[PDB]
Design a protein around this ligand. Structure first.
Ligand code: 3PE
Ligand code: A1AC9
Ligand code: R16
Ligand code: CA
Ligand code: CA
Lengths: 233, 243, 219, 165, 118
């Protein structure tokens, strides 16, 4: 039992200090130090190896099951719709609606992309600047800053709703996510305005606002495949 | 975490340590051994099978549908560079002995009978390694000759450590608190051996390349961990005090 | 295989050694003069005073054993050592956090490096013939033949120890007809091809794969 | 035979021209051609049949007026009669025919369902036309419209239009 | 962890002392955090290194050649060396040599050592 506790590495040091106080400090460490390295690390390395090695068998076996092939089908499939749905929008515009061309042109423009990124950067400061006893003015700054950022984020969200096809906007997974958070922010304004908030409400309603930080890491594809593969499984 | 505290509470519940009681350890050993085996399978299978598919897309779709979208289509004379072979192993000895020199200094004894003895060993090593600083002048570099010295930053580190030791003696006469930190930075001696050991250079270089690839993962965790901290602050913004 | 692999990757294990030494020295000095006392983590049995003691504390924090409690012990404002003739540091928060991250990462690199360099055995279906089969073939041959006394000397089927895993349908007799024997089984145990030209095709493979004596390879 | 001083440009779309879904796919495409080939390109819109050409009464004058524009010294011809390279193989006017493709037919249903439910049930009448367009080898399959977006798909038309001009 | 968990559960209100098990629902926050970062994300990083190293390892994939089983096997072509056996020549030596080399002797000793530890 005493040996087994050491290998789990909890209480490992306490017994060592109860032995150093009985037979001196010189030799005893070799028993426990070698026990952890030989007992814990190697087996922890072995167990990791076989588990990692074994799953290569199933992963190789799963290749014949076409899990990647089916997954690849959805990825290319759903990607095309967004590309093809662009044509219809680019053609639906050949009551004057020539301004709709201008609004779309900004959506894909670099200036618009970084503008929202900066807004997301500000939103982090609004929330990250919490403090146990904030100055009485800081709460007002966070109060106004939260509201102002909420209007801009929804204001540009609606822009994409009209600039891009309503059905087209919901095609992309990320675009679906943005509606979820921005919709959640609206509840906060109503709940805070009407004084019907609950301790449960503020937590998640705060959490959604933080999730807007995921606006960052959009170009990056390493994480995109993780989530895409993750959702399939 | 406190796997022990729970066990001993369980054992004492069934009397003291004896034969009839004390067998409840079987429940805790079963729980930990069987419990931790499930977590490895569930989370390694999730993190390997799904991860393997994700990178497969990153290398299958990205590689080929971009192959197709692109398939759309001073004195320079009588210098002595000799003796660089024996010094190869010899220098590694001084670094090894120099590191041990600072591994033996006693911190607690301000007026130590040993630090003064060690202080001399720093002199000999400091003087010895300053010789190679002069030697490097003969070789291409010295911020000159197309910056041969600046093209190998690993060799620059050799100078910085020597300069750090040299600076310490100058400020030692002043007997000022500044030297308190300068001494700490001298610990960089062992890394000096990296530039000289061919087999070690590959390992340390391989570590950096890994970090560059990992950058796509650690960056995600930092945002995720920071996201939890932001939630954490709201939940417990100073409610944890206790008289 | 694992013990063998650790030998093939010594320099990686040296890197983790350098991490302990570098951090042990830094901790040895900045937190050298902390006041020892019971009821606190920095006590008679834990302290950055002697190098062996410091490295053990670094090892202690490596396995995550109340390391966070030590981090609070080295924070500034702690009484100083009686030897000193107000004595801690605030570098601890970075010191222990940085060590655990770096130590945890290098151990990960050390663990995975051994796994991958030994990935052949770990992922092996154990159905196709492997090196183990050759070794047990040597032992029976060795028991069937002492030191360097066998060239052909084959007139009996006592070498029947081969089970289903590489006289059913007389294939053994045909295989037997087709170190000399050792190469014979491998070229036919996997059954690379059956076209009446494997030797000619394989005779052109060992030429490019290779070096050593080739007057026994053709057989 | 003899070049009619021009290489008329026509577009079959991914399916029957009788519906709106195919129509929008090209109106945007046509626009970019005339904004980057000022004068070089000309556009013609007709509603009669061209298959019955002898190298119905209205079709008699259809070829000449197309030729009349072709005499002015590309020309884009828009018609609802061509649904397969065979329809234009009956005459040798050196036409250039461009094909819109949906590599996976599964995309069509999502696209068709989006515009309106009235024509959603007509996917069978439409998806079939796409299949008919998936049997012509390169020879009757000259122009390649495979990429989804426009900016990187339209440019694949201009480069093919530099063969002579 | 548990010391903080039970100091967080006993959290009444901002700037106020603790109340025993005021809100045990808060444990969801720690359990969710433990699973996500400590267990899940930590495994992704471990899995990523294993896969990333595999790309480096398979740099010399050489798809043209056949499986790696041949690589070991052909490299084993230099095998089949003499192995020390030294069958006894003296009749007296052979008697003891057979029994000690007997499978019974190997199994018999394993019983003794097991008893020795007992
Ligand atoms: C890097 C590799 C470092 C290897 C260190 C090997 C040290 C061997 C000699 C240690 C020895 O004999 O002393 C044990 C020492 C405790 O010494 P002690 O007598 O308690 O101190 C009296 C202070 N007046 O210290 C100990 O208790 C030993 C701690 C060893 C920790 C090794 C961990 C490796 C990872
Ligand atoms: C300083 O280096 C280390 C110090 C301490 C430790 C490991 C160290 O190195 C590693 C080696 C291998 C890996 C990660 C780290 C990878 C390994 C692993 C190991 C691992 C994980 O928990 C977080 C998670 C993972 C992810 C999956 N794969 C399989 O270790 C565990 C436990 O898992 C069995 C555990 O039970 C759940 C409890 C503890 C620990 C560690 C041990 N400590 C901190 C505390 C308790
Ligand atoms: C987004 C970067 C982090 C900014 C927020 C953290 C630092 C400022 C708040 C904490 C200040 C504490 C002072 C007492
Ligand atoms: Ca613990
Ligand atoms: Ca622990």
């Amino acid at each position: 039992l005493t040996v087994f506790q050491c290998i789990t590495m909890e209480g490992w040091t306490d017994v060592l200090y109860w032995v150093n106080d009985a037979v001196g400090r010189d030799w005893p460490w070799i028993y426990f130090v070698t026990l952890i390295i030989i007992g814990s690390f190697f087996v922890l390395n072995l167990v990791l190896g076989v588990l990692s090695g074994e799953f290569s068998k199933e992963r190789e076996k799963a290749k014949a099951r076409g899990d990647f092939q089916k997954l690849r089908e959805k990825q290319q499939l759903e990607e095309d719709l967004k590309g093809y749905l662009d044509w219809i929008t680019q053609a639906e515009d050949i009551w004057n609606r020539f301004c709709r061309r201008k609004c779309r042109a900004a959506v894909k423009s670099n200036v618009f992309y970084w503008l929202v990124i900066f807004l997301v950067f500000l939103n982090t400061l609004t929330i990250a600047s919490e403090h146990y006893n904030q100055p009485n003015w800081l709460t007002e700054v966070q109060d106004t800053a939260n509201k102002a950022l909420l209007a801009l984020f929804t204001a540009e969200m609606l822009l994409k709703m009209y600039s891009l096809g309503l059905q087209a906007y919901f095609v992309s997974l990320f675009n679906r996510f943005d509606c979820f958070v921005v919709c959640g922010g609206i509840l906060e304004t109503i709940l805070v305005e009407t004084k019907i908030m609950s301790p449960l409400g503020i937590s998640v309603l705060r959490c959604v606002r933080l999730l807007r930080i995921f606006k960052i890491t959009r170009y990056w594809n390493s994480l995109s495949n993780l989530v895409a593969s993750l959702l399939n499984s | 975490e406190d796997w022990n505290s729970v066990m001993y509470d369980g054992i004492m519940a069934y009397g003291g340590p004896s034969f009839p009681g004390m067998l409840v350890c079987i429940y805790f050993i079963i729980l930990f051994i069987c419990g931790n085996y499930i977590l490895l399978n569930v989370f390694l299978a999730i993190a390997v099978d799904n991860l393997a598919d994700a990178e497969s897309l990153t290398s299958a779709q990205k590689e080929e549908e971009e192959e197709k979208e692109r398939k759309k289509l001073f004195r320079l004379q009588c210098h002595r560079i000799v003796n660089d072979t024996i010094f190869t192993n010899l220098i590694l000895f001084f670094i090894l002995l120099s590191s041990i020199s600072l591994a033996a200094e006693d911190p607690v004894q301000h007026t130590s009978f040993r630090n003064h003895i060690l202080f001399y060993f720093d002199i000999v090593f400091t003087t010895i390694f300053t010789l190679e600083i002069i030697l490097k002048m003969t070789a291409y570099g010295a911020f000159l000759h197309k910056g041969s010295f600046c093209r190998n930053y690993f060799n620059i580190l050799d100078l910085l450590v020597v300069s750090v030791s040299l600076i310490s003696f100058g400020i030692q006469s002043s007997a000022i608190n500044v030297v308190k930190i300068l001494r700490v930075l001298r610990v960089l001696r062992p890394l000096r051996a990296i530039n000289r050991a061919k087999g070690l250079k590959h390992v340390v270089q391989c570590v950096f390349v890994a970090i560059r690839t990992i950058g796509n993962i650690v960056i995600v965790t930092t945002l995720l961990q920071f996201m939890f901290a932001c939630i954490g602050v709201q939940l417990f913004k100073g409610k944890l005090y206790t008289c | 295989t694992f013990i063998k692999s650790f030998q093939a990757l010594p320099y990686v294990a040296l890197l983790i050694v350098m991490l302990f030494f570098i951090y042990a020295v830094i901790g040895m000095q900045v937190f050298g003069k902390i006041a020892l006392n019971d009821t606190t983590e920095i006590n008679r049995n834990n302290n950055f005073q002697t190098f062996p003691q410091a490295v053990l504390l670094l090892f202690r924090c490596a396995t995550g054993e109340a390391w966070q409690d030590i981090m609070l012990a080295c924070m500034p404002g702690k009484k100083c050592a009686p030897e000193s003739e107000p004595c801690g540091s605030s570098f601890a928060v970075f010191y222990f956090i940085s060590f655990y991250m770096l130590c945890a990462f290098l151990i990960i690199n050390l663990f995975v490096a051994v796994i991958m360099d030994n990935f052949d055995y770990l992922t092996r279906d154990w159905s196709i013939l492997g090196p183990h089969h050759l070794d047990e073939f040597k032992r029976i041959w060795a028991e069937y033949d002492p030191e360097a006394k066998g060239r052909i000397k084959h007139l009996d089927v006592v070498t029947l120890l081969r089970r289903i895993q590489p006289c059913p349908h007389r294939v053994a007799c045909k295989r037997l007809v087709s170190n000399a024997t050792l190469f014979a089984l491998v070229r036919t145990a996997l059954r690379i091809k059956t076209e009446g030209n494997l030797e000619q095709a394989n005779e052109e493979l060992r030429a490019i794969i290779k070096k050593l004596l080739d007057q026994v390879v053709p057989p | 035979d003899v070049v009619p001083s021009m290489r008329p440009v026509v577009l079959v779309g991914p399916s029957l021209k009788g519906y709106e879904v195919t129509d929008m796919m090209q109106k945007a495409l046509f626009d970019f051609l005339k904004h980057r080939f000022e004068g070089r390109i000309s556009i013609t819109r007709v509603t009669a049949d061209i298959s019955l050409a002898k190298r119905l009464a209205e079709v008699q004058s259809e070829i000449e007026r197309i030729f009349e524009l072709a005499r002015t010294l590309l020309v884009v011809l828009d018609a609802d009669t061509i649904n397969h390279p065979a329809q234009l193989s009956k005459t040798s006017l050196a036409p250039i025919i461009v094909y819109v493709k949906i590599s996976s037919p599964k995309v069509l249903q999502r696209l068709i369902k989006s515009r309106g439910k009235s024509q959603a049930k007509h996917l069978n009448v439409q998806m079939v036309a796409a299949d008919k367009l998936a049997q012509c080898p390169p020879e009757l399959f000259d122009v390649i419209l495979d990429e989804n977006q426009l900016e990187d798909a339209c440019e694949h038309l201009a480069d093919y239009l530099e063969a002579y001009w | 962890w548990p010391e903080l968990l039970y100091r967080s559960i006993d959290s009444h209100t901002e700037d106020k002392g603790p109340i025993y098990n005021y809100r045990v629902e808060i444990s969801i926050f720690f359990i969710i955090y433990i699973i996500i970062i400590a267990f899940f994300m930590m495994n992704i990083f471990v899995g990523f290194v294993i896969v990333t190293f595999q790309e480096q390892g398979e740099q010399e994939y050489k798809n043209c050649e056949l499986d790696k089983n041949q690589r070991q096997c052909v490299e084993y072509a230099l095998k089949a060396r003499p192995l020390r056996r030294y069958i006894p020549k003296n009749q007296h030596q052979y008697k003891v040599w057979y029994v000690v080399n007997s499978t019974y002797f190997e199994y018999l000793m394993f019983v003794l050592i097991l008893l020795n530890t007992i």
